[PDB]
Amino acid sequence: SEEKAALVLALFDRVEADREEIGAAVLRRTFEEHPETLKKFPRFLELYKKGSPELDALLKEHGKTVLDALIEIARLRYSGEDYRSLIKELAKSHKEEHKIPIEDLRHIAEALLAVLAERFPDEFGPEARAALTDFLDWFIAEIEEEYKK
Numbered sequence: 001s002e003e004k005a006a007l008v009l010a011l012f013d014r015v016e017a018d019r020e021e022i023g024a025a026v027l028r029r030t031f032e033e034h035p036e037t038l039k040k041f042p043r044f045l046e047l048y049k050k051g052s053p054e055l056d057a058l059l060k061e062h063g064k065t066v067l068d069a070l071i072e073i074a075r076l077r078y079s080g081e082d083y084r085s086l087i088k089e090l091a092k093s094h095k096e097e098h099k100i101p102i103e104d105l106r107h108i109a110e111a112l113l114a115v116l117a118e119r120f121p122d123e124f125g126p127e128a129r130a131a132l133t134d135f136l137d138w139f140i141a142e143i144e145e146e147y148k149k
């Protein structure tokens with residue numbers, strides 16, 4: 001467990017340094033594999049539909065925002081700090097404001113696993129994959145629990 005905790009933090013350290021490219025790749029992977037998920041993101045849907053040249057920059061911008069939230073929550077959890085405030089307002093905005101089902105959130109987490117296996121093939125081994133999958137399963141269950149309130 002303590003090994004997995006260190007693997008998660010070290011992995012997110014490397015993701016943080018390349019968050020714009022990785023975040024854009026995660027959003028691209030999610031939207032291509034799940035057009036039903038892209039439909040629930042109106043701004044990205046219209047930029048995709050119209051072949052807008054601004055799409056790449058906005059994918060990098062928002063992809064960094066998504067990864068920054070995951071990185072911060074992981075650092076708070078595995079350091080014994082209070083992450084409840086971030087989990088609640090992230091779940092509030094996505095259930096009430098953005099109206100995003102939990103399954104679409106899983107598509108993002110599944111895309112992050114697939115992107116990291118491609119971007120870090122010699123570091124993202126079985127230990128790193130199992131540790132990140134455990135955190136992502138934990139993150140989804142926490143948001144899902146806040147949904148059921």
Ligand code: HEM
Nearest residue numbers: 037038040041065066069070090093098100104105108109
């Ligand atoms: C692990 C999954 C996800 C994470 C960590 C995440 C994180 C975030 C964060 C930190 C923000 C900015 C602050 C906020 O609005 O709360 C945001 C905004 C937003 N999210 Fe996500 N999100 C996830 C999944 C999704 C998915 C799958 C969709 C839609 C298909 C979505 C739709 C949106 C929208 C529409 C916004 C507003 C962006 C804007 O107004 O510029 N989220 N998300």
